[PDB]
Structure 1
């Protein structure tokens, strides 16, 4: 897996961008091209930065489930979380060399995790429009109106001390939003929801020369 060594000032946590998703659209959220990149074909609704608590939960009254609703429940950002796509980007800093098992405990309605330079995004280009890779580490999809898969896991081998691009794209098509995010470290340590000290951001520096490490090994 391709990693990076950005030399700018490090920022804490991951950037989160918000994009429109059509209420009750039961097709788009499950299109692989949409989850990978097409979500950015609309104007960004806005963004927040510095996020370390990655897990998503929005709920509302069952009497309202066929309807849009304004709330700040997603990352403090005022939107309609009943119907929205979220892109989280940053860099993962492995404390140790080994296999890392990322997990989505379940999902509602869809989410992907991509890991690696030229997979999640290009090294030193975190803030750019999305690249087109559908080589997902995790691809979770809730069937329309039925139970979502659980313990949806994916492994990446990482070398200590390099920064690995990560991208989570998440969509809610209606009603409840759910995405519990965790990772199991090579020592068996579980990191649940709060990724402080494991995820960082760097401002784009497309001039930096030695940013990409094709083979960290």
Structure 2
């Protein structure tokens, strides 16, 4: 017929057309998280919004390189250098550095997480922004691995509300990727979630990430409808807008018919 029929039973992911000044990159908020607390980040409510009930440590904006790869120091014979986790051995040393004299189980201070001086050993962070699909079709987001706990949410009223990026987190636990650290221990690699997206609409995107001890890891990718993969550097795909709670037409509940 003259018009597309629309995704079945309001199935389309909600998106946005914010009218304000677009900024390259995502906003990163940092929140307090306790060293060796392996239980707090196992709860859906905590990972969706509860993190923001803890002390906010700071923020950085305009981040396009969004993967996390934090390595603890090895205090070695030849100085102090970051140790790739797969190179750690024994009790303990780091391959090519010898034995390390420092503890794996204390807090360490570093700017490795987006240049913000904090404790990547123990912290929770919230990345927010809008994903701009250049192509219409199925997009598959993935975490290659999760160390320690993480979620990824896409869509208006799922990640956050349109034109309200900077507001307190919404309560939705309808995660696109659920990488929450299981209670019973365990969890596989290459965890994934798929969203059908219409080109040129801005899709709210939230990533919440937490680490309790030592190494922290979150390699983020998206496979595009053309089958190519974008990993780590999402420049050209992720943007921020200052809140405009007064922009009435900002929410597009169904981009398939808009």
> What is the aligned partner in structure 2 of residue 8 from structure 1?
20
Shift of 1:64: 2.5
Alignment counterpart, residue 214 of structure 2, candidates 175, 181, 204: 175
Query: Match for 2:150 among 103, 111, 122?
Result: 111
* Matching residue within 15, 24, 37 for 2:36: 24
Aligned-pair distance for 1:141? 3.5
Q: Provide the residue aligned with 1:140 in structure 2.
A: 179
Offset at 1:143? 5.1
Unaligned runs of 5+ in 2: 1-12, 75-91, 93-101
Name stretches of at least 5 consecutive residues in structure 1 with no aligned partner: none
Please report the RMSD computed on the Cα atoms of aligned residues, expressed in angstroms.
Answer: 1.4
Distance 2:104 2:157 in 1: 38
1:29 Cα deviation (Å)? Answer: 1.1
Question: Which portions of structure 1, spanning 4 or more consecutive aligned residues, are displaced by more than 3 angstroms?
Answer: 141-148
CA distance in 2, matches of 1:22, 1:42: 10
CA contact (8 A) 1:109 1:177 kept: yes
* Structure index of larger Rg: 2
> What's the secondary structure of 1:64's corresponding residue?
coil
From 62, 79, 83, the counterpart of 1:50: 62
Question: Is the partner of 1:125 in helix, strand or coil?
Answer: coil
TM-score (norm 2): 0.82
Corresponding pairs, count:
217
**Counterparts of 2:22 and 2:31, CA distance in 1:** 26
Q: Give the distance between the partners of 2:55 and 2:24, measured in 1 at CA.
A: 25
Aligned 8 A contact 1:140 1:149 in 2: no
Give the distance between the partners of 1:216 and 1:143, measured in 2 at CA.
35
Question: Are 1:199 and 2:211 an aligned pair?
Answer: no
In structure 1, C-alpha distance between the alignment counterparts of 2:184 and 2:71, rounded to whole Å: 16
Q: Which of 139, 154, 165 is the aligned partner of 2:204? A: 165
TM-score between both structures, scaled by the size of structure 1: 0.97
**Separation in 2 of the partners of 1:70 and 1:43?**
17
Deviations 1:146-180 (A, max 9, x none): 66420101000000010000000000011100000
